[PDB]
């Protein structure tokens, strides 16, 4: 899964995902622009 795959690797992401999980994660960190 695309989402899973970028997110978990970068900490920051993968810490924010343990909280809300990578969907919310991802739209967070790679959403924008």
Same mark, same amino acid.
């Not at 970068?10 to 967070?28: K, M, S, T, V």
């Given at each position: 899964? &695309?989402?899973? #795959? =970028?997110?978990?690797?970068? &900490?920051?992401?993968?810490?924010? %995902?343990?909280?809300?999980?990578?969907? #919310? %994660?991802?739209?967070?960190?790679?959403? &924008? =622009?």
């Amino acid at each position: 899964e &695309p989402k899973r #795959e =970028v997110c978990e690797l970068n &900490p920051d992401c993968d810490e924010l %995902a343990d909280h809300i999980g990578f969907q #919310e %994660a991802y739209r967070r960190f790679y959403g &924008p =622009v």
